[model samples]
Target: IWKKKYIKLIVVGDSGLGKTTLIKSLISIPGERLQVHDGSYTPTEQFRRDPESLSSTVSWRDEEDRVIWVYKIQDTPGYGDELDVFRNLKMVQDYIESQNRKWLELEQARIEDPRVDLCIFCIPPHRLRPIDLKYMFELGKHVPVVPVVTKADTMTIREANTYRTEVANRIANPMVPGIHDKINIFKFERDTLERAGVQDHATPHPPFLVIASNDISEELAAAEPPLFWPERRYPWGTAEAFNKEHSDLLAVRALLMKEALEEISKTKRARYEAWRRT
Candidate 1:
C-alpha cells in the first residue's frame, strides 16, 4: 500500500487571461491523478457583460489520490480595462462585496478539512493599469497572492525578461492609496507576517511564475461550442494549449509548480511539528 499527500491549490487572476485554461491543464495531466470539481463565479446573464464574466474555482485530487480544492481564479469583470466606466466597476465591486462573505464561508469549510495549501494569482503581460492595483491590493488582503505572469510566449526572450523585471519592481513596491501607506504588493505579504510578530518562518517572495495560456482553439473549435467553462477541459489539454500559445512559458509552469509545492509542503511540515509538540 502507498500513502498519498493531499494538497489544496487555488488559482486567481484577471479574466480572459486563461485562468480556466490553466486549471484544465492541471486536471488533464496523466499521472498527477486529480479529482476535480468546478466552482466558477458568474453573474446573472441579464447584466449584459461578457458571457465569460465569472471566475473559476475547482477542487481536485492530485497524484496518489491527494485531494486539492481550488478557489476563485480569473478576476471578476476582467481586472482593469476589461470593464470601463464607473458603473461597471461599481457593479463588479458590489458583486465581489456581496459574494466575499459567501466565499469566506466556503473557504472556511474547506480549511477546516483539507485546508488550502497553495494559492496562485495569474497576471498577464498587459500593464498593471492603475485601476487593477486597487483590486490587487484588496486580493492581497486575504491570502499570500502569488503572482503568475501569463502569455509569456507572446514576448521574446528579451521582452520577457524586461517584463518580469517590471512586475518584480511593482511587487516589491506595490502602489496603494494614502489610507494604507504600507500596502505595497510584495511588502504587504512579507511585512504583514513580520508585523504579526510571527517567528522567522518561510516568507515567499513576490509573484514569481511567468506562464502563457494554452491555445486549444483548433481542438476547442472542433468541439460543439468551444470549451466555455474553466474546469470543462483536463490537464493535458490545458498544458498542451498553454504550450501552444506560450511555448516559452511552458517551462515556467513547471518551475512555478515546484515553488508552490515547496511552500505548501513546508507549511504542512510546520503544522505537523506543532501538532507533535502539543
Candidate 2:
C-alpha cells in the first residue's frame, strides 16, 4: 500500500518479464486472483479447453488510490533467435521512437495533463542484450525511465551480481555513442550503481524502488471460485503468463499500481514544475 497522492504510471517492458503478473499482485485483494497466459493455448480457450476468453484489462486502486497503467507489455518476435536479431532490434527501436513522438504530441496539446505520469522500463534478469540496452536509452530520451530488474527471484545472487555489473558497465560503456551519455541514470539506494563505480555519475534523483513481482498463482488458486484463476497451478504461471497474453486486448489499463506510487509522486511533481513555467 502506498500513501502518495495524485499520480498515474505506465509500465513498459519486454514480454515474459512478468509485467502483467506484477500488475495483478499490486491490485489484487484477498480472494481475488489473476492468471497468466498459457502460450500453448489460444486466447479463446484455457488449458481446460473451456471457451472463455480472459479479460483484456484489470484495474485496482493502490493503498494511496493512485491509478497505474500497464500499457501492452509485448515481446517482439525473434528477440532470442540469432537469425532474427536485426529484425527484433528494428522493431524495438521503432517502438521507443514512436512512444516519444506520441508523448511529445500529447504534451504539446495540454502542456499540463496530469493523468499520464512516468514510465517504468522492466529489464529482465537474463543477460542484458545489446538491443535491450539500446531501447532503454531510446526510452530515456522522452521521459524519466525507472529500470526494474524483473525475475530477480529466478537468479542466484552471484548471477544477479554479474548482471548488475554488466548492465552498469554497458551503461557506462555504451556501444551506441551518445545514447546514454546525455541521459540521467536513476538508481535505487540499494542498487549496485556504486559497485560498478557509477555512484558519482548517477543522477541526483533518488533511486527507484527495486521490487521482484513473484508468481502468486498458488495464492490465487487457493481462493474460492467466481474469480477466474487460470487452471495452471504455478504462481508465476497464474499471474505473469495468464495476464500478459491478454494485456494487448485490455485497452490501455491500470495494473499493479500501488508498488509505483512513490515514482508517480515524483513524476507528478515534475509535471507540476513543467506547468509552473508555462
Candidate 3:
C-alpha cells in the first residue's frame, strides 16, 4: 500500500455549472475504477451542503504503483450566484485567509501539508461574463487560478474554438482596469509538451475547456473500443472527456497534478511571503 500524501485544491464556479460533477469525474472510485455519469442525474441538496465551504477527499495510486496522492478539494457555494458580487468575493477571500492561517500554523509546527495548491475556476463554454472575469482577477491574486470551460459538450466544435480564442484575448486584455496586475496560468514545459507528442502551438495559455461527465451507464461502459472511456453521450455523437479534440481535460489534468508542481511552489512562496510581510 502506498503512503498517503495530501494536496489541497479549491474549485470555484457559479452554481449549476457542474463543479461538483467535475470534481467527482476526476476522482477514482473503489475497485480502482473510474466511471462516467448518466445524463439524468441531478445533485441533491446534501450534495451542495455548506455552499460557502465544502470539502471532499479523493485518493488514487500513480501508474507506477509506488505513491498514493490524496486531494483535499474545496468547493465554493454561490460564487456567481449573488447579485452583490462583493459579498461572494469576500466569502472566498475569507476562506482563503482562513486556509492560509491554517497553513501558517502548520508551518510553524513543522507539519507538511500542501496547503491550497491551486484553484480551478469553472465557467460555461460561452462568452465570459463580467463576474467571471472579476472573480478570476481577485482569486488569482491569492492563488494560482486555472479557468476551465464546463459543459463543453454543449458547444459545437466551431463555437468552442471561437470561444476559446475569445477567452484568451479577453484574459490578456482585461475589460476591467487595474483588476489584476498580472495573471498567470500553468503552462506545460517545452520538454513535457515534446514528450507528450504535443506541438508547442497546440495549447493555449489559459482558460481551457474541460468536458465533465458523471455517468456510468452500461451503454457508456460497453461502447465501441476507442470511445469506451468516460464520455458524454449526445444524440448526435459521443464526446470523450479526455479526448484532446473534444476537451482539454488531459492537458488540464497534467498541468494541475504533475507538470505544475514547480509553479504551485512558486505561487505558495509568493502568497505566503506576502502574508508574512503583511
Candidate 4:
C-alpha cells in the first residue's frame, strides 16, 4: 500500500474541554472505517510530552478504492493541573518544536512531513483566559494554531454569540498589554477576508465554538444504505453532532482538512522556514 494525502494535527487546551471527543468527530465521516492507533497521547496523570502524545491515524477511501485522505491527530494531556501548568505547556511547545525540527532535518527524498499542519487551541466557552493566551503566544509561531471554543453545547445559542464576540474582541484588541502585537494565529481563508476588505488587526478569525459527543445514534446512521454518525436525543428534538445548527464540527472539518488544507500547510511551511532560518 502507498501513502495518501494526509494531515497531522496537534490539539491543546485545558484538559476538560472535550478535546478527545472533538477529534473523534472530526475524523468520523460516513461510509468508511478510520483506523485508530492506540490513544496513547491522552495524559491520564501529570505526564511528560516527549515519548508519546496520544496520536491516531485515520483514513478514508473513494469509490475507486483509492485512499482519499489519511489524517493523523495528536493529543496532549493539556494544562490546568493547578500543580504545574507550564510543565505541560512547555512539553506541548517542545513537541511542536521538535516535530518541526524533524521535518527540517529530514532529507528531501519524499519523506512524510511530520510537521503538524494544525494546532487546535481549545479555549473555554467564554472569554480567553490567561493560560490560553500564554500557550497560544508561544505555540502559534511554531505551528498554525486554529482557536476553538470546545463544548459549545454547554451554552445557549444567544450566550454563544456573545462568547464568540468577546473572544474576537480579545484577538482584535489584546486584553493583556505585554505582546507587541496580537498573538499570531493562522487565518483560514485570506481571499475572503481580502474581498471583504478586512484590512487586518492581530487576526480577524473568531475562535470557532464547536461541540462533539461520544454518542452515535446507529438508527439515525442508516447502515443499510451506508452511513454512520453521532446523535444526542432530546425530548424537544435531537442534536445532530455533524449538523451546522447543532455543532460546528463540520465547519472545523472543512476549515482544515478540506477547505484550507493546502493554505494551512503553505502557512505552516512559511512559519517553519522562517523559524528555521533564525
Candidate 5:
C-alpha cells in the first residue's frame, strides 16, 4: 500500500513582494487545465481577518513512491503591514501553538504525528529591510525559515546576484542590536543539488532568489508548447520562473518540499520541543 504524508508550510513576509502569487505558482502544474490567477490577485481583507482563510493543498509523488501532501497557510491580515509590527508576530506564534497543541494531544494518546512543517520568508530582490530582519529573527526562533528573494524577473542578473550576496551576509552577521546567530535558515543538501542538476559549488545556502509569475502575455501564450508557466515576458525576452538557468525557483521548491523534510523533523524534535518545555 502506498503511504501518505502531510506537510504544512506558512509563507511570511511583507504585504506585497508577490507572496500570494508565489504561493499560486508553487501549486501550478504546467500543461494542466487549471485556472490561473491574474496579475492583480492579492489576498483579500477576509484572509487578513482570518488566519485560516487563505490556504491551499497540493500533492506530489516522492521518489519512494509515496504520496506527499502539502498544505500552505498564509499569514493573517496586518502581518508586517501595521505600525505596531508585533501583532502579526503574535498571530503566527498563536497559530503554531494551536497546531502544536494538537500534536501534543496526539502524542499523549500514542498517536505520534506532527503538524506545521516549515515557514518561507519572502523578500524582494533588493536590499533587506530592517523589518525583514526583525521578523525573520523572531520567527526563526520558532520555525525553520527559508528566505527567498521574490520577483527575480524585476532585477538584472548582476543586480540579483549582488542583492542575494548582501542579504546572505546580513543574515549571517546581523548588525541589529537584538539579533544573534540563533536564527536557523534552511541550507542545501548534496542530494538536492544533484537532483536539481545544479553544481554544488555554485549554490548559496539560504536567502536564495526565486521568480514567480502568475500571468503571461498573449503572444507567449500562443507560442510553441504554449507558455502556461509563470513568467515575466518583457519586451526584450522572457524570464522563465522555474527554469534553473533563469531563477532559483526549482531549487527553492525542491528544498522546501523535498530535501528539507529531514530538517523539519529535527526542528520539530529540537526547537519545538525546547519551546514546549519552556
Candidate 6:
C-alpha cells in the first residue's frame, strides 16, 4: 500500500561526538531529547505512545526516478558523558526488539513497518575506546552498525589516514586487545556500490571518516550563490565538510542517505528475515 520505501536509522555515540551536527545535516525537522528514567520514559512506554514519532523523516529520489526513499533518522542524546552507559544502550536494544515484535503483529494488517534498518555509530576520530567496542558489537546484535569517525578536521590529514587504518585494523583483526565479538557492520556488495556510482566501496578500509559542521566560512557566507554545504574556518586554514578528498562525508552521505540506500535496505530486509526466525 506504500508508494515509496521506508527505512529507520538511529544515531548513537558519545557526548560531543558531533551527532547533533550530523543529525541536523541528515534531516530538517527537529527531534526531542529522549532519556530512560525510572518509570518516566521506558523504552516500551515510549514506543507504545507512538513508535514512529521519535525520528525526523526525509525523502530522496534518484535521478532515474524509479523509486524514492523515505529515511527516518533517530539521534540519541544521553550517552558517554556518564560511565554508566549500559542502560542507554540496553534501552536501544529493547527498542530494536520492540520494533521487530511490533512488525510481526502489524505486518499481518498491511501497516507500515517500524523496523530499524541501520545505525550510525559516531566515534572519536583520535582513538578507539573499549566502550566503543562494547557499543558497536552489542548494538549489532539487532541492527547493522556503521561507525562514522567524527572530528576529522581536528586531526591532520596524515594523522586521520593513519587513525582510520588503525581503527579498521583493531576492529577487523579483533586480536589487538579486549575485542571478543566479530563486528556486525553493514556489508556492501560489489554491484550495490557499482550500480549506485559509489566510488569508495572499500569494505572496512576506512570506518567512514567525516567532518560534519553547521558553520561556514565568512567568504562562503558572502559568496554569489551562497555556498552552504557546511564548512569550518580554522586558524590554519579551512576544511570543507563535503569535500571527498579531505573527508569521507560525501561518500558516506551518498552511500547511506542517497546512492546505495537500496543496498542498505536490502541488507536490512535480510536481517529482519533472520530475526523473524528464532
lDDT of 3 by residue, 1-278 (tens): 66555677888877678887777665544343454334432322333455333566666677674667776767666465656677767777777787778888887877446467678888767778877878888887777777788888878888887887888777777778656575655455667545433434443664667777665445655666423356667787777876788877766666655655444555556667876765
Could you give candidate 1's per-residue lDDT for residues 1-278 as a string of tens digits? 33344454445556566555555555443344432324343233423465233333343445654545343333333443345444444554444343444445676677332343344566777466544555555554433445667655445666766766776666656564532643323222334434333234233343433343333345655687554222124454343333323342333344434324444555654443333332
Tens digits of per-residue lDDT, candidate 5, 1-278, equal: 65556667888777777777777666554432343555553443565466565676556556666645443545444365666678878777777777788887887777324467678888766778777788888887777787888878777878877887788778887788878665677555667656755445343664667887776667767989666566687788888877787878877666665565555555556655677874
Model 6 agreement with the true structure over 1-278: per-residue lDDT tens digits: 32577788888887777876776665642232222112122133443466455567777554565566677877565466556788778877887888889888888766465788889999897888877877788888888888889888878877877887888876776553645778888777756655534456344545877877777567775889665556777787888877876777766765666556667766766888899786
Error of 2 at 268 (Å): 2.6
Global lDDT scores for all candidate models: 0.45, 0.44, 0.67, 0.69, 0.68, 0.71
lDDT of model 4 at position 209: 71
Instruction: Tell me how many residue pairs clash in candidate 5.
Output: 1
Q: What's the TM for model 3?
A: 0.78
* Candidate 3 global lDDT: 0.67
Clashes of each: 15, 15, 7, 2, 1, 0
Best first by TM-score, ranked: 5, 6, 4, 3, 1, 2
Worst 10 residues of 3 by lDDT: 38-47
Considering summed lDDT, which 10 consecutive residues are worst modelled in model 1?
195-204
lDDT of 3 at 117: 69
Which candidate number maximizes TM-score? 5
Task: State the displacement of the C-alpha of residue 240, model 1, in Å, after optimal TM-score superposition.
Answer: 7.9
Candidate 2's C-alpha runs over 4 A off are 1-6, 29-36, 39-115, 172-175, 178-180, 184-263, 269-278
Per-model TM-score, in order, reads 0.51, 0.48, 0.78, 0.80, 0.83, 0.81
How far out, in Å, is residue 171 in model 2? 3.1
Worst 10 residues of 5 by lDDT: 28-37
Clashing pairs in 6: none
Candidates 1 and 3, the one with greater lDDT: 3
